[PDB]
């Protein structure tokens, strides 16, 4: 039997969890022993885990836990923590892409005789990433995009979309976005068209699902993927759409999707751009119209146009935190088949690939 120990997150406002009560129940049904730290910040109530069969333990107790427990969490270790890491860990460690102090992160493992299985690079047998948050990133990005567009119909340009807060469940989010949307329509606003780039993937599907659920029909959604962008930008369709949602991270030096010249047009319709995969450290940002990474407490940034109506960007890197419960359920269920192979992790390719990758980065230190 494998023992997993779900550590409490400490990163500010991180309410997601790598295992949910549901995935815990499912692992227990397979003979796992599951410990769950009593986490202040989690969107899940600790009673949920208890009722699932988890053994509840104090927050931070992983640090003194027996060597044989596999420690599982989402976020990287606090850069401040210096003690050797003696356990096998499953987490996003953020030390494989030459991040600052990456060697020190790994030295903690080396000194400890611990092992990292990094969630960012966990790969199935067909070479695809096992678990990520793209669907809910798209769903939340579409939600905020519609909210921003609606807001613009009912408020003056000197006001911006107010601070946003996570929702306890998807229905609650949809109810609020629908309310805002219908209010905007009731003013006689032309029904908006929404252009999505990367429409066919998980992120794109998430955005589309939100749009559908708030009453936006396919007739008003322009679903673009590789074929549509292959002609090369800039695309006139972007300023012509009311809302533009970008659902694919692109960092190689190609022609941009849009630019200030194209946006500086009194006939532009576009009001709101949601760059779901925004990363201001992108070496070749194909939507070169913002430099600010916006955040929940100030979710939009002005695009400084010289003609046309007020245009704003949403460039939040934490969109899945808008719905931490569902984000966690999707993530943990995507990860579940791999977790079920942990008893055979010495031979199961998903885990062997991860150990090998860890070993290779440790060798560079
Ligand atoms: N340059 C591009 N233009 C438009 N769509 C793209 C481009 N590159 C990748 N995609 C699509 O983006 C989606 C990414 O899917 P996912 O990683 O599941 O969110 C897939 O449907 C890809 O085909």
Q: 296 vs 19, 64, 171, 314, CA distance in Å? A: 24, 35, 19, 10
Which of 354, 360, 364, 359 has the alpha carbon at shortest distance from 92? Answer: 354
- Are 171 and 225 part of one and the same domain? yes
Is there a single domain that holds both residue 62 and residue 122?
A: yes
C-beta of residue 221 within 8 angstroms of C-beta of residue 194: yes
CA-nearest of 246, 278, 266, 336 to 307 is 266
| φ, ψ of residue 28 in degrees (nearest 5) | -55, -40
Helix (H) or strand (E) run with residue 243 in it? strand 243-246
d(CA 160, CA 206): 25
Same domain? For 66 and 137 the reply is no
Our measurement of the distance from residue 102's CA atom to the centroid of its chain's CA atoms, rounded to an integer in Å, reads: 22
C-alpha–C-alpha distance, residues 62 and 24, integer Å:
17
Same domain? 240 vs 339: no
- Shared domain check, 337 and 318: no
Active site residue 5: no
What is the CATH classification number for the domain harbouring 234?
3.40.50.720
Cis bond upstream, residue 77 (ω within 30): no
Residue 3 has, within 13 A of its CA and on its CB side, a CA count of 12
Query: DSSP code of 344?
Result: G
Residues 238, 170 share a domain: yes
- Ligand 1: distance of its center to the CA of 199 in Å? 7
- The phi, psi pair for 57, rounded to 5°, reads -135, 165
Beta carbon of 132 within 6 Å of any ligand 1 atom: no
Report how far ligand 1's centroid is from the alpha carbon of 198 (Å).
Answer: 4
Of 198, 254, 330, which is best to mutate to test ligand 1, by the most ligand atoms within 8 angstroms of its C-beta?
A: 198
Q: Among residues 11, 30, 63, 75, which one is catalytic?
A: 75
Active-site annotation holds for 94: yes
Q: What is the resolution of this structure in A?
A: 1.8
Q: How far apart are CA 356 and CA 235, in angstroms?
A: 43
Domain count for the chain: 2
Which tokens sit at 220?
């008003």
Q: What experiment produced this structure? A: X-ray
150 with 178, same domain: the answer is yes
Here the tokens at position 160 are: 């911006």
Q: Is the CB of 196 under 6 A from ligand 1?
A: no
How far is Cα 309 from Cα 303, in angstroms, rounded to an integer?
10
Measuring from atom 17 of ligand 1, which residue has the nearest CA? 201
Estimate to the nearest angstrom the gap between the alpha carbon of 163 and the chain centroid.
19
**Does one domain contain both 300 and 172?**
yes
The residue among 192, 99, 109 whose CA lies nearest residue 149 is 192
For residue 89, the enclosing domain spans 1-132+324-365
């Amino acid at each position: 039997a494998v023992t997993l120990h779900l550590r409490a997150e400490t990163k500010p406002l991180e309410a997601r969890a790598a295992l949910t009560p549901t995935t815990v129940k499912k692992l227990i049904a397979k003979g796992f022993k599951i410990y769950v730290e009593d986490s202040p910040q989690s969107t899940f109530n600790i009673n949920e885990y208890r009722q699932a069969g988890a053994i509840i333990v104090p927050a931070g107790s992983w640090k003194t836990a027996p060597r044989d427990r596999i420690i599982i969490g989402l976020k990287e270790m606090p850069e401040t923590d210096t003690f050797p890491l003696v356990h096998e860990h499953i987490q996003f460690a953020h030390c494989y892409k030459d991040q600052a102090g990456w060697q020190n992160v790994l030295m903690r493992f080396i000194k400890g005789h611990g092992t990292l299985y990094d969630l960012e690079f966990l790969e199935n047998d067909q070479g695809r990433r096992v678990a990520a948050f793209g669907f809910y990133a798209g769903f939340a990005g579409a939600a905020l995009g519609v909210r921003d567009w609606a807001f613009k119909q009912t408020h003056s340009d000197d006001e911006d979309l107010p601070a946003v807060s996570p929702y306890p469940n998807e229905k609650a989010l949809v109810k609020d976005v629908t309310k805002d949307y219908k209010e905007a329509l009731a003013t006689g606003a032309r029904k908006p068209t929404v252009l999505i780039i990367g429409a066919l993937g998980r992120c794109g599907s998430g955005a589309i699902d939100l749009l559908h659920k708030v009453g936006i029909p396919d007739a008003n959604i322009l679903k673009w993927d590789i074929k549509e962008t292959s002609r090369g930008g800039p695309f006139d369709e972007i300023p012509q759409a009311d809302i533009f949602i970008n659902c694919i991270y692109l960092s190689k030096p190609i022609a941009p999707f849009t630019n200030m010249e194209k946006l500086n047009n009194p006939n532009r319709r576009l009001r709101t751009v949601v760059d779901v995969s925004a990363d201001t450290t992108n070496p070749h940002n194909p939507i070169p119209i913002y430099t600010v990474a916006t955040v929940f407490n100030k979710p939009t940034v002005l695009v400084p146009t010289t003609a046309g109506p007020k245009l704003s960007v949403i460039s939040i890197d934490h969109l899945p935190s808008l719905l931490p419960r569902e984000a966690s359920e999707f993530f943990s269920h995507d990860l579940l088949p791999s977790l079920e192979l942990l008893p055979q992790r010495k031979t199961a390719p998903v885990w062997v690939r991860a150990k090998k990758l860890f070993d290779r980065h440790c060798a560079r230190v």
